[PDB]
């Protein structure tokens, strides 16, 4: 809907930054709306969903097992590790690490998962192998959040991310059980409360993952729709603002409310 493009255009205005937007029908693949679809933006935390796709892909091939326990130490803890910090003696299963990376955005968990696949280079090879020759991870947590203008490391485009997430969720790459697990973690997300979630009426599905980094960066990827009805994929990134966190949050909710209202 043009009124959703209008809200996205208002958002550039109010944030003083570029916003990239994609609304994609999930079942059919038809792109319903786009805006700056081929511009690069920092992936920030939205990458952790790709990362767990790679892992679930290794599970399917028998190169990984979700029940395997990983032991780590105090010195692997990096800022913002709500779950990993509580299991120094205990360790975590790979399944517990995905859940933490997805639902809590645990940075240590993502680093541990990246070690299991053999690093950010391998994530990019995974992506490149599934048809996305655009998106790349180059660094580990916390440095992948830098967000230097014009730097292509740790970036994606609204169009590449939207279609990649489309293939992960419903394409021919993962098993039915892996597709289902991915969606389940994304539905349990706890850190995107003030974004698209807050626009959603009762009786709606949503499975999402948000991100934030330096230089005013904000983003969310989502699948969502009325329960039992054809879902859409939505991908919003903005970078370059000096605006507050809460005002970045409020522009994404206002975009969400237009999309929902004009569904």
What is the domain-level CATH number for residue 112? 3.40.710.10
Catalytic residue among 3, 38, 85, 143: 143
Nearest to 81 by CA among 97, 63, 64: 97
Packing angle, helices 47-61 and 176-188, rounded to 10? 150
Asked if 124 and 72 count as a contact pair (C-beta separation under 8 A), the reply is no
In this structure, the strands spanning 69-70 and 92-93 are: antiparallel
- How many Å apart are CA 153 and CA 97, to the nearest integer? 24
In order, the DSSP letters of 126-152 are HHHHTT-SS-B--S-TTGGG---TT--
Q: Which residues, in sequence order, are CB contacts of 208 under 8 Å at separation 6+?
A: 186, 189, 192, 195, 196, 197, 220, 221, 222, 223, 224
Q: Which residues, in sequence order, are CB contacts of 217 under 8 Å at separation 6+?
A: 41, 42, 44, 145, 147, 211, 237, 238, 239, 240, 241
User: What is the domain count for the chain?
Assistant: 1
List the resolution, Å: 2.1
| Residue 119: burial class (beta carbons within 10 Å; 0-12, 13-18, 19+) | middle
Asked if 55 and 64 count as a contact pair (C-beta separation under 8 A), the reply is yes
In order, the DSSP letters of 23-48 are EEETTT--EEEEESTTS-EE-GGGHH
DSSP character at residue 104: I
Q: Which domain holds residue 214?
A: 1-263
Q: How far is CA 123 from CA 31, 57, 78, 132, 185, in A?
A: 26, 11, 20, 11, 19
Residue carrying the six token digits 């939505």? 234
Which of helix, strand or coil describes residue 125? Answer: helix
- How many Å apart are CA 74 and CA 249, to the nearest integer? 32
Asked about 143 being catalytic, the answer comes back as yes
Q: Which residues, in sequence order, are CB contacts of 79 under 8 Å at separation 6+?
A: 107, 142
In this structure, the strands spanning 217-226 and 232-239 are: antiparallel
> For the range 13-18, what are the long-range contacts, defined as Cβ-Cβ under 8 Å and sequence gap of 24 or more?
14/243, 14/247, 14/251, 15/216, 15/238, 15/240, 15/241, 15/243, 15/247, 15/248, 15/251, 16/240, 16/241, 16/242, 16/243, 17/216, 17/238, 17/239, 17/240, 17/241, 17/243, 18/238, 18/239, 18/240
Q: How many C-beta neighbours within 10 Å does residue 204 have?
A: 16
Q: How far is CA 209 from CA 2, 87, 198, 222, in A?
A: 25, 23, 14, 7
Q: Can you say whether residue 120 is alpha, beta or left, with left for phi > 0 and alpha for psi between -120 and 50 degrees?
A: alpha
Catalytic residue among 34, 45, 99, 105: 45
DSSP character at residue 63: S
Asked if 70 and 93 count as a contact pair (C-beta separation under 8 A), the reply is yes
């Amino acid at each position: 809907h043009p009124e959703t493009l209008v809200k996205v255009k208002d958002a550039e205005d109010k944030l003083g930054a570029r916003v990239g937007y994609i609304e994609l029908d999930l079942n059919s693949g038809k792109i319903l709306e786009s805006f700056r679809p081929e511009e690069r933006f920092p992936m920030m935390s939205t990458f952790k969903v790709l990362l767990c796709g790679a892992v679930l892909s290794r599970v399917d091939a028998g190169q990984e097992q979700l029940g395997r326990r990983i032991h780590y130490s105090q010195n692997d803890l990096v800022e913002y590790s709500p779950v990993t910090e509580k299991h120094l003696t205990d360790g975590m299963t790979v399944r517990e690490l995905c859940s933490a990376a997805i639902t809590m955005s645990d940075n240590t968990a993502a680093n541990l998962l990246l070690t299991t696949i053999g690093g950010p280079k391998e994530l990019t090879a995974f992506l490149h192998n599934m048809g996305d020759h655009v998106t790349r991870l180059d660094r580990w947590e916390p440095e992948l959040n830098e967000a230097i203008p014009n730097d292509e490391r740790d970036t994606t485009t609204p169009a590449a991310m939207a279609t990649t997430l489309r293939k992960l969720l419903t394409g021919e790459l993962l098993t039915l059980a892996s597709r289902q697990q991915l969606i389940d973690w994304m539905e349990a997300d706890k850190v995107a409360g003030p974004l698209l979630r807050s626009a959603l009426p009762a009786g709606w599905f949503i499975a999402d993952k948000s991100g934030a980094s330096k230089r005013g960066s904000r983003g969310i990827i989502a699948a969502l729709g009325p329960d039992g009805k054809p879902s859409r994929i939505v991908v919003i990134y903005t970078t370059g603002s000096q605006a507050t966190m809460d005002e970045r949050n409020r522009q994404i909710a206002e975009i969400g409310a237009s999309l929902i209202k004009h569904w």
